Amino acid sequence: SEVQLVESGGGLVQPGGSLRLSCVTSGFTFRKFGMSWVRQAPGKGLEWVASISTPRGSTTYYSDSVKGRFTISRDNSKNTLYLQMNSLRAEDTAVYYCTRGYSSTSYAMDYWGQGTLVTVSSASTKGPSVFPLAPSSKSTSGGTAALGCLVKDYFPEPVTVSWNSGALTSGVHTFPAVLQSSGLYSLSSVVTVPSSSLGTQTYICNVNHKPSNTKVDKKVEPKSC
Amino acid sequence: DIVLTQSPATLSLSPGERATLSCMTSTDIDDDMNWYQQKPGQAPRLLISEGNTLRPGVPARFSGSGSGTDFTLTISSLEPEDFAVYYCLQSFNVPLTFGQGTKVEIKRTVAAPSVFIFPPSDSQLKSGTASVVCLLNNFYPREAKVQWKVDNALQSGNSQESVTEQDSKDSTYSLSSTLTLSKADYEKHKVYACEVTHQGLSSPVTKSFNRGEC
Amino acid sequence: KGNYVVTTH
User: Fold this and answer.
1) In Å, how far are A29, B90, B129, B191 from B210, measured between CA atoms?
2) Strands B70-75 and B62-67
3) Do A104 and C4 touch (CB under 8 A)?
4) Which residues of C touch B (CB under 8 A)?
5) Which chain A residues are within 8 Å of B34, Cβ to Cβ?
6) Which chain B residues have a beta carbon less than 8 Å from that of A46?
7) Do B12 and B85 belong together in one domain?
8) Which of A23, A182, B19, B118 could form an SS bridge with B75, CB 3.0 to 4.6 Å?
9) Which residues of chain A neighbour C6 with C-beta distances below 8 Å?
10) Which 8-state DSSP code applies to residue B116?
C-alpha cells in the first residue's frame, strides 16, 4: 500500500493518567485530508473517537465518551496526527487506529494504521502461576484424553504457551485470555492425546510471560492414586 | 446518535454461496453508508463507500445496495478469503457510528463436543483458590450452553468462558469454562459437574467428579 | 444534510 499510517505512543497507563498518541503518515498529501481516530476494545467492535478538519484542523469532533478528556490535533509540516488523552479510564483500553477520511467531504475512513494498544489499569506486573489440568483417571481405554495447563493471574498481556517445546501442535487449543475482576488475566491451554500414551509420553506446557521474566515448564501427568 | 443494526450477527455459509448482510439505521441517512471487512489481528479495509461506491481494487463480487434506512452488502459468491467480520458505518452525521458487526463463518456438518472436566490441582488449593475447568472440544455450530452444578445447585455469576477461532482444518470451535471458588467454598462441597447443551447432543452431557477421588 | 465539515477555508 502506498498510503501508510503509523501510530505510536501507546502503552500502559494508570487510571487518571495521560498519554499522547501520534500518527505519522506517508504516501499522500496529508494537509489535504480530514483524519480520525477510531478504537477497538478487546473482543469488541469499532468505535469512532474523534475527527479533525483539513487543512488547518480548526474544526474538530468528539464522541461523548471522550469529549472534554481527549483532544485531536495535527501538524501538517510533520505529516502527523495527535490524540492527547487525559483522565484515562479502564474502559478506554483499546487498540487506537489512525484513519484517513476518504474524501474532501466525509470522515468515512479509507486507510487505517496497524493500531496502537492503550491499556488503562491499576494492576502491577505479575507473572502467572501455572497449574496442571491433569488427564482423567477415567480416560477411555484406547480412546482420546484431554490435559492442559491453567495459566492464572498474570499482568499485562501477553503470555505464550507451547507444548513439548513446540514439538506437539496437533490437537492443541490455547484459549484467549480472560480479564478477571481482580484486574489480572488467566487463560488455559489444552491438548487432546491418545489415552494409551498417558503412562509413557511426556507432556510439558512451556509458558512464557516476558513482562515479568516468568518462564515455567510444567509437566502435566496423571495424578497419583 | 444514529444506531446501526446489523443482522444476522453470524452468517454461516460455504465457499461459492451468496452472502447477504443487512444494516438498518435508526433514521434516514441518505446514501452515506460505508462497509468494512476485518480479519483477526488486522486493521479494517474499506469495501464500499457513500453512494454504494465500490472502492478501487475491491473485487467485483462485493456490492452495496439500498439507501435511506435499509442497506445490504452482497458477496455474490464467497471466496475462502471472504470469511471475516464485516462492519457498516454511517458518515451522514457525527457521531460517526458503526454496526456491531456480522461474522461470515464457515458452515459445516453438526459436530458434538467431547467434554472434559478438571478439578483444581493441589498446588492451586495450597494457594487459597480453586478453579474448576470444563473443556468442550471440537464442536459446530457455535451455540453451546455450559451449566456448572455444585452438589446439584446451579451456579451463576462465578464462571467465565473463552472460545477459539474456527479451526483451519475442521472448521470447529472449542470452548473452556472456568468456575472460580474460594478454597473454603470448594471444600464444603462434594460433587462438581459441568452440563453441556449443544444441538449435536441428543440430550445434555454431564461430566463430573467427587472431591477426594482419584 | 450532514452536521459536520471536513474541508475548511
Assistant:
1) 68, 55, 18, 5
2) antiparallel
3) no
4) 2-4
5) 108-109
6) 36, 38, 44, 87, 89, 98
7) yes
8) B19
9) 34, 51, 53-54, 101, 103-107
10) E
Resolution at which this structure was determined, Å: 1.5
In angstroms, the CA A222 to CA A217 distance is: 16
Experimental method: X-ray
Query: Does residue B151 share a domain with residue B55?
Result: no
Q: Report the CATH fold assignment for A1-122.
A: Immunoglobulin-like (2.60.40)
Distances (CA, A) of A42 to A17, A103, A224, B41, B87: 20, 29, 40, 11, 16
Amino acid at A123: A
Q: Contact partners of B by the rule of 3+ C-beta pairs under 8 A?
A: A, C
Residue of C nearest to B1 (CA): C3
Which of B108, B126, B143 corresponds to the end of one domain? B108
Distance from CA of B48 to the nearest CA of A (A): 10
Which of B54, B88, B108 lies at the terminal end of a domain, its last residue? B108
CB-based contact C4 A61, cutoff 8 Å: yes
Q: Are residues B175 and B195 in the same domain?
A: yes
Cis peptide before B95 (omega within 30 of 0): yes
DSSP chain A: ---EEEEE--EEE-TT--EEEEEEEESS-GGGS-EEEEEE-TT--EEEEEEE-BSS---EEE-TTTTTTEEEEEEGGGTEEEEEE-S--GGG-EEEEEEEEEETTEEEEEEE---EEEEE--PPPBPPEEEEEPPPTTPPTTSEEEEEEEEEEEBSS--EEEEGGGTB-TTEEEPPPEE-TTS-EEEEEEEEEEGGGTTTS--EEEEEEGGGTEEEEEE--PPP-
**CATH topology for A123-222?**
Immunoglobulin-like (2.60.40)
Residue A63: is it exposed, middle or buried by C-beta count within 10 angstroms (0-12/13-18/19+)?
buried
Total domains in the fold of chain B: 2
